[PDB]
Amino acid sequence: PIMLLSGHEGEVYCCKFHPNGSTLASAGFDRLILLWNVYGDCDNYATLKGHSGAVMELHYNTDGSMLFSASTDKTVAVWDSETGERVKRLKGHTSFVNSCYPARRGPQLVCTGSDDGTVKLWDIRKKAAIQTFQNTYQVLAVTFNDTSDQIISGGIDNDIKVWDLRQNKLTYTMRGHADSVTGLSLSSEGSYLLSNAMDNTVRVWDVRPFAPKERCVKIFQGNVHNFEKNLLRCSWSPDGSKIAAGSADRFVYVWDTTSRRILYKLPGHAGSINEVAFHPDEPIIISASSDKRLYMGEI
Amino acid sequence: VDALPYFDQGVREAAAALVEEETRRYTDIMRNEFERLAARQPIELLSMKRYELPAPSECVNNSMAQLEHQAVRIENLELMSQHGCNAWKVYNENLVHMIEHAQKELQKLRKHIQDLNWQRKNMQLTAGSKLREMESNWVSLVSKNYEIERTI
Amino acid sequence: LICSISNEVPEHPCVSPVSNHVYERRLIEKYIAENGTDPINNQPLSEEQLIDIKVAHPIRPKPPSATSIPAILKALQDEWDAVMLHSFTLRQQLQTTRQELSHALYQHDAACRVIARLTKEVTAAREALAT
Amino acid sequence: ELSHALYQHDAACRVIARLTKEVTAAREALATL
Amino acid sequence: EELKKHEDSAIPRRLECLKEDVQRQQEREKELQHRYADLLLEK
């Protein structure tokens, strides 16, 4: 089956799948975070309330107990996935929080970026910023490597930047986007980082202790951005074999991580697509878009 | 144990020598007696070579034998000619039903033989890729570990 | 169409109900008296368990040169020649299969020792590159 | 038994051909290093 | 028929060996970086 989900009154910007594949989380412009049953009759249970701005990005921690939510109200909330109670508010950035990531494995860490041009490292136990990286241009997307040593940030400067937690220096610069980067994501192996950008280029970059030194490992095409200037996010399949990235042309694009052939171009959406997610066990795709509906495609 | 036949397109004489070097290191009665003796010796037991030759002027018996068998012969050729070719071509039809059944089994075996090989082919191509993936990653470490040490 | 014992084309075929296979009555009747079980499947089978089958009968055209004379002399001689020299040659074929069996299993076990010897060799050579 | 052996013998024989060439590659690699 | 049954088992053993062979190679890669990473600490 396909399965069509509806309920969000406004644009859906992000959706994720619980690490154990039992539930979905979704949120957008409404300001509500909805939880869904992946199986059964695809029912909706708890609604998380308390964000005053729109929800720009959701993530689960690796355990699926904590759900992180960057909002436009400058606050990043930490949510209990079990009860739906709010845990903490990371008040800190002076402007909109565009995105956030939670470090897997290591002691609890959270990274954020915002329109104030800074990137901040948070320890959820301190109620204060740990480190600050002033960039100079607004920051749109940010992710940790698997070792929790490096911060990867994508902004409007067309240059993905890598930060060293110990040195606090600009370690790496990646050139190869011609325009703003709207969405970043690490492979489950730590091996590769996936990027979307206005230039309509999906680029994979490889991050390793020993690097070729010009890490434009692969380039994919199909994915269109337009006058809506929506943030666009991309995801890796659980096994790193497939790449999905949303577009503004109503199609979900899925590519073969090797041959780079388009495996799927999927319709059903009426408007622009903001995020595509893969179920952690089975070939199921959750596609979230601005038309306020979700699809559960099965491959 | 594992040796991919379909995938390995690229030694038999070499491997034969190595296998050769490990090898350098390591109910019937009387019937059966006369039958095995006849086959071993390569000699068939002689029959009655008497009835055909004989001679005019013991031979009174041999003569009277030739008559009764000749009358039985001429009666044995009468009942054959009465039916004639109808009895022969009726058996010829049976032989065509017997033949076609064998070649149907030739096909059934042909299909299941190619069907088993067809399943093997996919397995060979599945793993041969996975082995290719492993070797690429193997060579990457091999040089990665070096380039780490060179800089240190 | 044939019998599953002698390799005949049966005159009175009979089928067993434990294993669907047609035998000629005389040859299946002999097996049950020798040891009361089905020859192919080795399942319990008796003479009453058998079921006679019917067909349009089999026809052999007795040759044009058919008399008591060739049938006694030439034809019967050839039949006991053909029985004798075949089973002797078949006993020769069974003897070589057992000899060629021994050359197969020895060469197989010879290869097993090469693999076991090379399994210790390869991974330790790869390990030495790691070290 | 004859057929299954001869097939599996020459099949197991190809294990050696593969194994020998890899073993050989490990030698010059380590030797030259 | 026989070639299928004996082969199908040999491949998991072929792969599982190379899988564990790969795991060890990853460890040497995983440490050699850290010594390079510690070059920046002394600076």
XYZ file of C-alpha atoms in Angstrom:
658
model
C 0.000 0.000 0.000
C 0.869 3.700 -0.280
C -0.893 5.150 2.883
C -1.814 8.836 3.012
C -1.455 10.825 6.219
C -3.170 14.098 6.932
C -3.745 16.351 9.896
C -1.148 19.057 9.877
C -2.938 22.276 9.218
C 0.187 24.037 7.824
C 3.275 23.051 5.770
C 5.191 20.044 6.995
C 8.896 20.700 7.123
C 10.276 17.641 8.660
C 9.507 14.148 9.553
C 11.481 11.359 11.018
C 11.182 7.731 11.766
C 11.758 6.401 15.271
C 15.048 4.434 15.491
C 13.165 1.231 16.221
C 10.785 1.672 13.270
C 7.606 1.626 15.408
C 6.621 5.325 15.050
C 6.929 8.592 13.013
C 7.360 12.178 14.108
C 6.350 15.126 12.022
C 6.128 18.824 12.364
C 5.998 22.033 10.481
C 4.532 25.445 10.237
C 1.543 24.642 12.527
C 3.872 24.301 15.481
C 2.609 20.854 16.468
C 4.664 17.742 16.543
C 2.627 14.666 15.643
C 3.470 11.120 16.435
C 2.251 8.289 14.244
C 2.056 4.503 14.355
C 4.110 3.058 11.505
C 1.954 -0.086 11.372
C -1.576 -0.902 12.604
C -3.917 1.625 10.972
C -1.302 4.394 10.956
C -2.896 6.147 13.915
C -1.902 9.497 15.381
C -1.409 9.738 19.167
C 0.437 12.466 21.049
C 0.755 16.009 19.967
C 3.685 17.902 21.350
C 2.749 21.424 22.346
C 4.950 24.251 23.385
C 6.707 25.558 20.341
C 5.778 29.208 19.601
C 7.750 29.405 16.370
C 7.510 26.918 13.524
C 9.345 23.623 13.771
C 12.237 23.679 11.391
C 13.932 20.356 12.269
C 13.288 17.174 14.187
C 15.694 14.498 15.165
C 15.654 11.472 17.359
C 18.604 10.501 19.533
C 20.012 7.079 18.717
C 17.958 5.496 21.498
C 14.664 6.988 20.379
C 13.907 8.404 23.825
C 14.673 12.019 23.091
C 13.318 14.123 20.258
C 15.019 17.398 19.373
C 13.224 20.312 17.816
C 14.704 23.448 16.388
C 12.136 26.231 16.176
C 12.009 29.676 14.620
C 11.355 31.066 18.097
C 15.086 30.718 18.794
C 14.512 27.865 21.163
C 15.582 24.286 20.731
C 13.411 21.972 22.668
C 14.188 18.562 23.939
C 11.196 16.268 24.059
C 10.387 12.996 25.755
C 9.245 10.618 23.058
C 7.446 8.399 25.589
C 5.199 10.883 27.420
C 5.391 13.943 25.249
C 6.621 16.135 28.042
C 9.100 18.887 27.377
C 12.482 18.458 28.967
C 14.633 21.475 28.156
C 14.682 24.755 26.282
C 18.039 25.725 24.819
C 17.661 29.491 24.877
C 20.798 30.996 23.394
C 20.773 32.018 19.780
C 19.810 35.608 19.047
C 17.901 34.655 15.933
C 15.934 31.849 14.309
C 17.271 28.379 14.877
C 17.476 26.886 11.436
C 18.697 23.388 12.416
C 19.998 21.019 15.065
C 21.676 17.632 15.472
C 22.216 15.349 18.437
C 25.509 13.437 18.802
C 25.063 9.687 18.687
C 27.128 7.437 20.968
C 28.977 10.054 23.067
C 27.821 11.969 26.179
C 24.743 14.041 25.305
C 25.547 16.817 22.841
C 23.555 19.019 20.545
C 24.590 21.288 17.779
C 22.667 24.195 16.372
C 22.889 26.828 13.690
C 20.887 30.057 13.237
C 20.454 33.263 11.314
C 22.842 35.063 13.684
C 25.693 33.350 11.792
C 26.768 31.207 14.725
C 27.035 27.550 15.481
C 26.664 26.435 19.055
C 27.513 23.316 20.963
C 25.176 22.431 23.711
C 25.395 20.199 26.642
C 21.764 19.568 27.559
C 22.808 19.449 31.272
C 24.307 22.975 31.431
C 21.513 25.324 30.242
C 24.245 27.350 28.508
C 26.256 27.308 25.272
C 29.552 25.452 25.437
C 31.227 26.724 22.283
C 30.396 29.291 19.711
C 31.614 29.481 16.147
C 30.912 32.838 14.601
C 30.758 32.308 10.875
C 29.584 35.587 9.206
C 26.770 34.306 7.029
C 23.515 32.745 8.258
C 23.824 29.021 8.989
C 21.239 26.568 7.622
C 22.250 22.952 8.379
C 24.562 21.216 10.857
C 25.677 17.683 11.725
C 28.279 15.801 13.832
C 30.700 13.095 12.637
C 30.364 9.663 14.352
C 33.340 10.375 16.577
C 31.636 13.521 17.979
C 34.855 15.490 17.294
C 33.789 17.510 14.316
C 30.945 19.788 13.387
C 29.812 20.080 9.816
C 28.008 23.286 8.848
C 26.209 24.357 5.698
C 25.204 27.987 5.203
C 24.626 30.488 2.459
C 28.249 30.847 1.470
C 28.254 27.799 -0.795
C 30.965 26.264 1.346
C 30.560 23.391 3.769
C 32.664 23.999 6.804
C 34.168 21.574 9.270
C 35.001 22.631 12.802
C 37.432 21.032 15.280
C 36.057 20.862 18.865
C 39.538 20.885 20.432
C 41.328 23.394 18.262
C 38.210 25.520 17.596
C 39.424 26.202 14.100
C 38.142 26.101 10.600
C 39.665 22.737 9.776
C 38.074 22.075 6.409
C 36.413 23.924 3.620
C 34.519 22.200 0.861
C 34.035 23.995 -2.433
C 31.690 22.598 -5.053
C 28.364 24.243 -4.385
C 27.515 27.227 -6.520
C 24.765 28.324 -4.130
C 23.291 28.040 -0.606
C 23.337 24.696 1.162
C 20.064 23.785 2.742
C 20.496 20.281 4.103
C 23.270 18.053 5.409
C 23.413 14.453 6.607
C 26.030 11.824 7.566
C 26.080 8.220 6.337
C 25.431 5.650 9.094
C 29.097 4.632 8.709
C 30.480 8.100 9.236
C 31.982 7.731 5.856
C 29.981 10.205 3.705
C 28.056 13.481 4.038
C 25.138 14.359 1.816
C 24.259 17.868 0.730
C 21.399 19.776 -1.008
C 21.778 23.233 -2.448
C 19.967 25.847 -4.437
C 22.205 25.150 -7.449
C 20.084 21.950 -7.863
C 23.059 19.767 -7.202
C 23.050 16.884 -4.762
C 26.657 16.242 -3.734
C 28.201 13.481 -1.633
C 31.379 14.375 0.250
C 33.661 11.834 1.993
C 35.156 12.717 5.355
C 38.074 10.577 6.517
C 41.289 10.922 8.478
C 43.070 10.231 5.182
C 41.302 12.197 2.447
C 41.819 12.459 -1.314
C 41.887 16.200 -0.688
C 39.182 17.014 -3.269
C 36.263 15.114 -1.879
C 33.545 15.672 -4.565
C 32.953 11.975 -4.451
C 29.764 11.999 -6.524
C 27.173 14.322 -7.986
C 23.482 13.641 -8.598
C 20.884 15.477 -10.511
C 17.108 15.887 -10.807
C 16.416 17.920 -7.730
C 14.874 21.352 -8.394
C 14.684 24.477 -6.106
C 12.476 27.488 -6.949
C 10.933 30.776 -5.795
C 9.602 29.286 -2.579
C 13.204 29.110 -1.202
C 12.213 26.325 1.155
C 14.910 24.582 3.112
C 15.525 21.202 1.480
C 16.760 18.153 3.378
C 18.152 14.853 2.276
C 18.540 11.468 3.875
C 20.601 8.302 3.663
C 19.034 4.896 3.569
C 19.704 2.730 6.682
C 22.300 0.744 4.699
C 23.807 3.680 2.762
C 22.755 2.222 -0.602
C 20.053 4.819 -1.440
C 19.881 8.582 -1.433
C 16.751 10.544 -1.152
C 16.336 14.246 -1.443
C 13.192 16.341 -1.671
C 12.572 18.940 -4.313
C 10.287 21.751 -5.176
C 8.946 20.059 -8.304
C 6.611 17.728 -6.492
C 8.773 14.707 -6.994
C 10.614 12.601 -4.486
C 13.903 11.709 -5.917
C 15.703 8.504 -4.929
C 19.047 7.634 -6.438
C 21.448 4.683 -6.467
C 24.408 5.784 -4.288
C 26.835 4.090 -6.782
C 25.623 4.231 -10.391
C 23.740 7.472 -9.641
C 20.708 6.336 -11.642
C 17.338 7.664 -10.550
C 15.608 4.751 -8.947
C 12.439 6.622 -8.110
C 10.809 9.820 -9.107
C 7.567 9.780 -7.170
C 4.483 11.914 -7.442
C 1.333 12.308 -5.415
C 2.346 15.643 -3.857
C 0.749 18.806 -4.984
C 3.385 21.256 -3.743
C 7.051 21.364 -2.827
C 8.656 18.514 -0.845
C 10.606 19.404 2.191
C 11.948 16.137 3.612
C 12.279 12.497 2.740
C 12.965 9.777 5.294
C 13.737 6.075 5.179
C 12.401 3.533 7.594
C 15.322 2.068 9.542
C 14.567 -1.620 8.800
C 12.308 -1.941 5.745
C 12.337 -0.122 2.328
C 9.675 2.403 3.314
C 9.824 6.080 2.476
C 8.100 8.892 4.333
C 7.763 11.922 2.152
C 6.834 15.251 3.743
C 5.759 18.256 1.834
C 4.226 21.622 1.851
C 0.933 20.196 0.741
C 0.402 19.059 4.360
C 0.214 15.411 3.554
C 2.611 12.525 4.013
C 3.050 9.359 1.993
C 4.416 5.989 3.152
C 5.887 4.630 -0.089
C 7.061 1.047 -0.063
C 9.856 -0.128 -2.325
C 34.869 -25.103 -0.517
C 33.754 -21.892 -2.286
C 34.824 -21.468 -5.925
C 32.669 -19.254 -8.160
C 32.233 -20.766 -11.658
C 30.072 -18.123 -13.407
C 31.915 -15.139 -11.926
C 35.513 -16.370 -12.300
C 36.139 -15.583 -15.977
C 39.951 -15.427 -15.558
C 45.694 -22.837 -13.613
C 43.995 -26.244 -13.934
C 47.379 -27.742 -14.897
C 48.999 -25.902 -11.972
C 46.389 -26.930 -9.383
C 46.420 -30.508 -10.738
C 50.137 -30.731 -9.874
C 49.534 -29.492 -6.294
C 46.680 -32.029 -5.888
C 49.003 -34.665 -7.419
C 51.752 -33.866 -4.874
C 49.279 -34.379 -1.992
C 48.423 -37.758 -3.564
C 52.151 -38.617 -3.793
C 52.127 -38.046 -0.006
C 49.033 -40.171 0.775
C 23.453 -64.617 -6.439
C 22.180 -67.318 -8.829
C 22.443 -71.118 -9.176
C 24.397 -73.161 -11.792
C 23.088 -70.689 -14.425
C 25.669 -68.062 -13.372
C 28.671 -70.434 -13.597
C 28.162 -71.448 -17.248
C 27.011 -67.943 -18.278
C 30.119 -66.241 -16.842
C 32.302 -68.990 -18.366
C 30.674 -68.526 -21.798
C 31.251 -64.748 -21.683
C 34.824 -65.010 -20.333
C 35.899 -67.650 -22.878
C 34.049 -65.803 -25.686
C 32.408 -68.984 -27.022
C 28.706 -69.701 -27.615
C 27.456 -73.269 -27.048
C 26.879 -75.133 -30.334
C 23.286 -75.817 -31.439
C 21.778 -78.583 -33.617
C 23.512 -78.198 -36.998
C 21.708 -81.222 -38.471
C 18.226 -80.432 -39.838
C 19.413 -78.206 -42.711
C 21.938 -80.465 -44.483
C 20.917 -84.185 -44.248
C 21.388 -86.654 -47.152
C 19.308 -88.946 -49.464
C 19.920 -92.731 -49.522
C 19.217 -92.328 -38.965
C 18.489 -90.200 -42.062
C 14.966 -91.700 -42.273
C 14.327 -89.828 -39.016
C 16.204 -86.705 -40.228
C 14.080 -86.748 -43.399
C 10.790 -87.099 -41.469
C 11.911 -84.163 -39.278
C 12.250 -81.899 -42.341
C 8.674 -82.674 -43.499
C 6.822 -81.893 -40.244
C 8.770 -78.666 -39.660
C 8.240 -77.675 -43.333
C 4.485 -78.247 -42.935
C 4.562 -76.283 -39.671
C 6.593 -73.642 -41.558
C 4.074 -73.362 -44.410
C 1.259 -73.114 -41.839
C 3.359 -70.557 -39.891
C 3.653 -68.424 -43.068
C -0.095 -68.688 -43.830
C -1.313 -67.047 -40.590
C 1.262 -64.247 -41.094
C 0.199 -63.444 -44.673
C -3.513 -63.556 -43.722
C -3.082 -60.445 -41.563
C 0.001 -59.398 -43.533
C 1.186 -55.814 -43.060
C -1.730 -54.793 -40.782
C -0.239 -56.639 -37.793
C 3.185 -55.049 -38.457
C 2.044 -51.427 -38.860
C -0.140 -51.781 -35.738
C 3.060 -52.458 -33.739
C 4.846 -49.623 -35.587
C 2.259 -47.197 -34.138
C 2.954 -48.468 -30.602
C 6.676 -47.748 -31.071
C 5.913 -44.082 -31.870
C 3.904 -43.684 -28.629
C 6.835 -45.267 -26.757
C 9.426 -42.957 -28.360
C 7.726 -39.580 -27.823
C 7.378 -40.305 -24.081
C 11.188 -40.506 -23.682
C 11.811 -37.136 -25.376
C 9.198 -35.467 -23.126
C 11.323 -36.559 -20.162
C 14.415 -35.231 -21.984
C 12.694 -31.821 -21.934
C 11.526 -32.050 -18.283
C 15.107 -32.841 -17.241
C 16.443 -30.114 -19.569
C 14.211 -27.469 -17.931
C 14.953 -28.358 -14.297
C 18.694 -28.653 -15.077
C 18.805 -25.149 -16.591
C 16.540 -23.944 -13.751
C 19.029 -25.059 -11.072
C 21.934 -23.392 -12.932
C 19.768 -20.264 -13.285
C 19.453 -19.950 -9.478
C 23.206 -20.502 -9.005
C 24.010 -17.700 -11.476
C 22.291 -15.036 -9.341
C 24.105 -16.244 -6.207
C 27.484 -16.044 -7.997
C 26.785 -12.473 -9.143
C 25.488 -11.449 -5.694
C 28.601 -12.470 -3.774
C 31.169 -11.697 -6.502
C 30.075 -8.083 -6.087
C 30.373 -8.321 -2.288
C 33.899 -9.751 -2.702
C 34.666 -6.859 -5.075
C 33.402 -4.456 -2.386
C 35.648 -6.121 0.209
C 38.799 -5.964 -1.951
C 38.312 -2.264 -2.746
C 38.018 -1.542 0.989
C 41.030 -3.797 1.597
C 43.234 -1.775 -0.785
C 42.017 1.490 0.757
C 43.205 0.545 4.256
C 46.455 -0.861 2.856
C 47.426 2.573 1.509
C 45.573 4.534 4.230
C 47.597 2.892 7.016
C 50.780 3.847 5.121
C 49.845 7.495 4.508
C 49.022 7.842 8.231
C 52.504 6.564 9.202
C 54.369 8.566 6.524
C 53.073 11.839 8.007
C 53.575 10.957 11.693
C 4.978 -48.781 -20.944
C 7.993 -50.673 -19.543
C 8.548 -52.820 -16.443
C 10.571 -51.368 -13.550
C 12.642 -54.490 -12.837
C 13.845 -56.297 -15.983
C 13.488 -53.518 -18.570
C 10.691 -55.362 -20.395
C 7.568 -54.256 -22.233
C 5.085 -56.129 -19.997
C 2.418 -58.612 -21.162
C 0.431 -58.406 -17.915
C 1.428 -55.173 -16.142
C 0.370 -54.731 -12.488
C 0.714 -51.574 -10.346
C 1.539 -51.433 -6.622
C -0.523 -49.081 -4.436
C 2.294 -47.943 -2.090
C 4.543 -46.661 -4.908
C 2.955 -45.909 -8.285
C 5.180 -47.984 -10.555
C 4.216 -50.585 -13.174
C 5.888 -54.014 -13.003
C 5.388 -57.203 -15.022
C 3.361 -59.603 -12.844
C 5.829 -62.534 -12.820
C 8.768 -60.348 -11.744
C 6.876 -58.485 -8.972
C 5.331 -61.755 -7.755
C 8.852 -63.196 -7.423
C 10.126 -60.208 -5.393
C 7.257 -60.402 -2.858
C 7.984 -64.095 -2.176
C 11.739 -63.430 -1.857
C 11.191 -60.524 0.563
C 7.692 -59.091 1.074
C 8.358 -55.427 0.231
C 8.244 -53.021 -2.724
C 11.561 -53.197 -4.667
C 11.919 -49.437 -5.347
C 10.639 -47.725 -2.170
C 11.323 -50.620 0.274
C 7.780 -50.287 1.682
C 5.548 -53.105 2.942
C 3.817 -54.787 -0.005
C 2.022 -58.122 -0.540
C 0.615 -60.060 -3.524
C -2.983 -59.055 -2.674
C -1.903 -55.378 -2.455
C -1.092 -55.342 -6.202
C -3.604 -54.066 -8.790
C -3.641 -55.516 -12.337
C -3.874 -52.937 -15.140
C -5.383 -53.201 -18.639
C -4.142 -51.800 -21.955
C -4.775 -52.374 -25.704
C -2.266 -55.314 -25.665
C 1.209 -55.430 -27.210
C 1.903 -56.840 -30.684
C 5.188 -58.214 -32.047
C 5.475 -59.032 -35.744
C 7.039 -62.498 -35.883
C 9.718 -62.226 -38.648
C 9.056 -63.402 -42.249
C 11.732 -66.110 -41.931
C 10.080 -67.596 -38.825
C 10.100 -71.373 -38.428
C 10.733 -73.875 -35.634
C 14.303 -74.137 -37.025
C 15.670 -70.560 -36.642
C 13.609 -70.056 -33.455
C 15.239 -73.166 -31.930
C 18.730 -72.647 -33.386
C 19.623 -69.087 -34.459
C 17.242 -66.857 -32.443
C 17.517 -68.690 -29.097
C 21.327 -68.859 -29.457
C 21.578 -65.091 -29.968
C 19.380 -64.465 -26.902
C 21.661 -66.383 -24.511
C 24.727 -64.850 -26.165
C 23.264 -61.350 -25.675
C 22.384 -62.135 -22.026
C 25.841 -63.614 -21.325
C 28.144 -61.021 -22.939
C 26.110 -58.064 -21.587
C 26.053 -59.004 -17.875
C 29.753 -59.954 -18.034
C 30.458 -56.552 -19.608
C 28.122 -54.977 -17.012
C 30.086 -56.680 -14.213
C 33.207 -55.142 -15.809
C 31.543 -51.696 -15.654
C 30.633 -52.051 -11.949
C 34.227 -53.045 -11.069
C 35.720 -49.910 -12.686
C 33.154 -47.578 -11.054
C 34.390 -48.712 -7.621
C 38.049 -48.260 -8.660
C 37.300 -44.836 -10.163
C 35.395 -44.083 -6.930
C 38.602 -44.616 -4.918
C 40.591 -42.296 -7.227
C 37.845 -39.673 -6.781
C 37.675 -39.697 -2.965
C 41.487 -39.793 -2.557
C 41.987 -36.859 -4.959
C 39.158 -35.060 -3.115
C 40.731 -35.531 0.328
C 44.084 -34.543 -1.232
C 42.472 -31.232 -2.253
C 40.956 -30.744 1.241
C 44.452 -30.858 2.762
C 45.711 -28.274 0.230
C 42.863 -25.897 1.141
C 43.392 -26.393 4.890
C 47.139 -25.817 4.352
C 46.494 -22.697 2.240
C 43.830 -21.349 4.665
C 46.547 -21.039 7.341
C 48.937 -19.592 4.744
C 46.787 -16.829 3.217
C 45.220 -15.204 6.309
C 48.605 -15.108 8.093
C 50.149 -13.462 5.005
C 47.290 -10.913 5.078
C 47.746 -10.544 8.846
C 51.463 -9.799 8.326
C 50.523 -6.909 5.998
C 48.230 -5.606 8.756
C 51.123 -5.834 11.244
C 28.860 -40.574 -6.299
C 31.396 -40.524 -9.166
C 29.706 -37.559 -10.863
C 29.145 -35.527 -7.671
C 32.791 -36.125 -6.697
C 34.427 -35.251 -10.047
C 32.342 -32.054 -10.270
C 33.066 -31.111 -6.632
C 36.742 -32.098 -7.088
C 37.397 -29.722 -9.999
C 35.212 -27.213 -8.119
C 37.401 -27.578 -5.022
C 40.404 -27.459 -7.408
C 39.462 -23.893 -8.416
C 39.632 -22.935 -4.716
C 43.382 -23.642 -4.895
C 43.959 -21.668 -8.120
C 42.351 -18.641 -6.448
C 44.102 -19.260 -3.117
C 47.558 -19.665 -4.708
C 47.461 -16.345 -6.588
C 46.364 -14.399 -3.473
C 49.040 -16.052 -1.335
C 51.509 -15.055 -4.079
C 50.285 -11.430 -4.048
C 50.870 -11.266 -0.271
C 54.547 -12.193 -0.763
C 55.745 -9.523 -3.236
C 53.619 -6.919 -1.435
C 55.218 -7.595 1.963
C 58.641 -8.259 0.390
C 58.733 -4.944 -1.491
C 57.408 -3.104 1.591
C 21.250 -30.195 -7.687
C 24.238 -31.153 -5.498
C 26.404 -28.250 -6.730
C 23.667 -25.879 -5.532
C 23.513 -27.305 -1.984
C 27.278 -27.441 -1.317
C 27.944 -24.033 -2.936
C 25.156 -22.115 -1.135
C 26.769 -22.917 2.252
C 30.336 -22.111 1.132
C 29.497 -18.473 0.232
C 28.361 -17.374 3.723
C 31.656 -18.842 4.998
C 33.563 -17.047 2.221
C 31.876 -13.730 3.028
C 31.881 -14.060 6.824
C 35.662 -14.592 6.699
C 36.180 -11.482 4.550
C 33.675 -9.627 6.775
C 35.798 -10.298 9.873
C 38.926 -9.667 7.756
C 37.444 -6.240 6.936
C 36.581 -5.483 10.590
C 40.247 -5.826 11.639
C 41.421 -3.617 8.751
C 39.002 -0.913 9.917
C 40.621 -0.904 13.384
C 44.096 -0.068 12.041
C 42.452 2.704 10.005
C 40.528 3.823 13.112
C 43.662 4.249 15.263
C 46.205 5.574 12.731
C 44.043 8.699 12.398
C 44.225 9.431 16.137
C 48.030 9.690 16.142
C 47.730 12.168 13.247
C 44.980 13.991 15.183
C 47.350 14.260 18.169
C 49.926 16.090 15.986
C 47.681 19.174 16.245
C 47.553 18.953 20.075
C 51.329 19.366 20.437
C 51.187 22.439 18.156
